[PDB]
Amino acid sequence: APSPTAPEQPVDVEVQDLEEFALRPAPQGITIKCRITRDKKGMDRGMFPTYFLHLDREDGKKVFLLAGRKRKKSKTSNYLISVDPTDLSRGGDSYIGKLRSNLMGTKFTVYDNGVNPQKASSSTLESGTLRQELAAVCYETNVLGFKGPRKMSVIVPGMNMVHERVSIRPRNEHETLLARWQNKNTESIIELQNKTPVWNDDTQSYVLNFHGRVTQASVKNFQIIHGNDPDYIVMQFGRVAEDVFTMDYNYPLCALQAFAIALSSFDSKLACE
Q: Where are the domains of the chain?
A: 1-273
Distance, C-alpha 120 to centroid of its chain: 30
| Long-range contact pairs involving 109-113 (C-beta distance under 8 Å, separation at least 24) | 109/133, 109/135, 109/136, 109/137, 109/176, 109/177, 109/178, 110/134, 110/135, 110/136, 110/137, 110/256, 110/257, 110/260, 110/261, 112/23, 112/256
Exposed / middle / buried, residue 260 (Cβ in 10 Å: 0-12, 13-18, 19+): buried
Whether the CB-CB separation of 133 and 170 falls below 8 Å is answered with yes
Amino acid at 210: F
CA pair distance 182, 177, nearest whole angstrom = 9
Q: What is the resolution of this structure in A?
A: 2.7
Query: DSSP label at 251?
Result: T
- What are the respective helix, strand and coil percentages of the chain, to the nearest 5? 15, 35, 55
Query: DSSP label at 70?
Result: E
Helix (H, G, I), strand (E, B), or coil: what is residue 266?
helix
Whether the CB-CB separation of 193 and 203 falls below 8 Å is answered with no
Q: What are phi and psi of 46, to 5 degrees?
A: 95, 25
Residue count (the chain): 273
- Classify domain 1-273 by CATH architecture: Alpha-Beta Barrel (3.20)
Amino acid at 112: D
CA pair distance 60, 11, nearest whole angstrom = 12
